[PDB]
Amino acid sequence: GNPFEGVQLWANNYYRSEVHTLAIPQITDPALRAAASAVAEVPSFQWLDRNVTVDTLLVQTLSEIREANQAGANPQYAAQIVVYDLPDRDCAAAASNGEWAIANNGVNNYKAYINRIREILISFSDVRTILVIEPDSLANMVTNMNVPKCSGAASTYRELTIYALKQLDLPHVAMYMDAGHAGWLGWPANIQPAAELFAKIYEDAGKPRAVRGLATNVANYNAWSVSSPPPYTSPNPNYDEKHYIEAFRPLLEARGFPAQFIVDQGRSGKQPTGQKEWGHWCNAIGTGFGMRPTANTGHQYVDAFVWVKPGGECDGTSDTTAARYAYHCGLEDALKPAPEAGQWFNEYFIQLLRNANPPF
Ligand SMILES: OC[C@H]1CNC[C@@H](O)[C@@H]1O[C@@H]1O[C@H](CO)[C@@H](O)[C@H](O)[C@H]1O
Ligand SMILES: OC[C@H]1CNC[C@@H](O)[C@@H]1O[C@@H]1O[C@H](CO)[C@@H](O)[C@H](O)[C@H]1O
Ligand SMILES: *[C@@H]1O[C@H](CO)[C@@H](O)[C@H](O)[C@H]1NC(C)=O
Ligand SMILES: [Ca+2]
Ligand SMILES: [Ca+2]
Helix, strand or coil: CCCCCCCEECCCHHHHHHHHHHHHHHCCCHHHHHHHHHHCCCCCCEEECCHHHHHHHHHHHHHHHHHHHHCCCCCCEEEEEEECCCCCCCCCCCCCCCCCCHHHCHHHHHHHHHHHHHHHHHHCCCCCEEEEECCCHHHHHHHCCCCHHHHHHHHHHHHHHHHHHHHCCCCCEEEEEECCCCCCCCCHHHHHHHHHHHHHHHHHCCCCCCEEEEEECCCCCCCCCCCCCCHHHCCCCCCCHHHHHHHHHHHHHHCCCCCEEEEECCCCCCCCCCCCCCCCCCCECCCCCCCCCECCCCCCCEEEEECCCCCCECCCCCCCCCCCCCHHHHCCCECCCCCCCCCECHHHHHHHHHCCCCCC
16 A cells, blocks of 8 residues: 555656756766766655645646656656645744745635645546645644744644645545654654644544655654664654654554654765754754665655655755744854755755765
């Protein structure tokens, strides 16, 4: 039942175009240019981070996959898409604040966005589609109820999550709900409360067939499995994603949710990282491209290692005067100067390339 089995993963043209139009013209070294071109072919998730992406980038990518598959691709290609446009998005940090606000028609806007995505996916029932649903949202509901914007958004996040899970429960779709990372929900105190929250949402959505499990480490830098805990992980015993998942799955399973996992490794190649504290998430120094996307995980509970966050796309601006400035992005272990979240950050791309493991 692994939705990553029996397909290959399509590398999308948005990221390929970033690398060829924004990155490569800035690289002169012949070997580095060639390595950059190779990264552009690694199949990372495409993000529906703005409403305008639905009718443009989603439809174009599904059209291109259809065309490649009709031309005889073997194995057939599958799409990898992130749904990331909740109103009052990114409730615990300014950096990825979205286009919609709950107080300004955000619920209606989001339900329409989900409905349009559904319409598109139904029309592309010939393209196997793997979705990650709303990075950070439910993890914020576990740990950030002390933050007024998160507390105020919780009931809306819950309603809209259940809406998405039901609406996008289509026969050719597999969904993974975002579930934080080892250094967030994997702390032993947070992990049972997290299991309870995720299992109840699953139950309240009616246990949709298409919900395959959870995504972890999205846009973070954790190791899958290292023998020695990186110093910044102390004193969390769940110091890597393998520890987190092996602790988390039994808890979820006892509560009726036999979740399979995908694990982001797109910025996990260099361990330990240059994070001075584990909570430093923004444009972290000392990181590299990590293990390539694969279903060959060597672990029963892990469907795939994936590249969810596309390395080179910024985590947040370092401009202290900007509306979306988060103090995390101005720290000494954040690469600077950095552009707005989601925009291309070429010096970061080069860092990831230099530190890539396996190398390009
Ligand atoms: O309060 C949120 C913290 C808790 N500690 C872990 C830290 O990662 C988390 O911050 C979020 O980190 C994710 C990436 O893992 C970011 O995408 C969020 O923007 C940030 O709030
Ligand atoms: O992980 C979700 C957000 C919030 N914090 C980490 C950061 O990297 C991420 O930003 C989003 O990244 C995606 C993929 O690059 C972009 O589409 C978004 O514009 C951006 O906000
Ligand atoms: C979102 O995009 C759709 C087309 O996909 C459009 O009809 C709708 O008006 C847009 N939503 C908002 C709130 O602008
Ligand atoms: Ca397997
Ligand atoms: Ca290696």
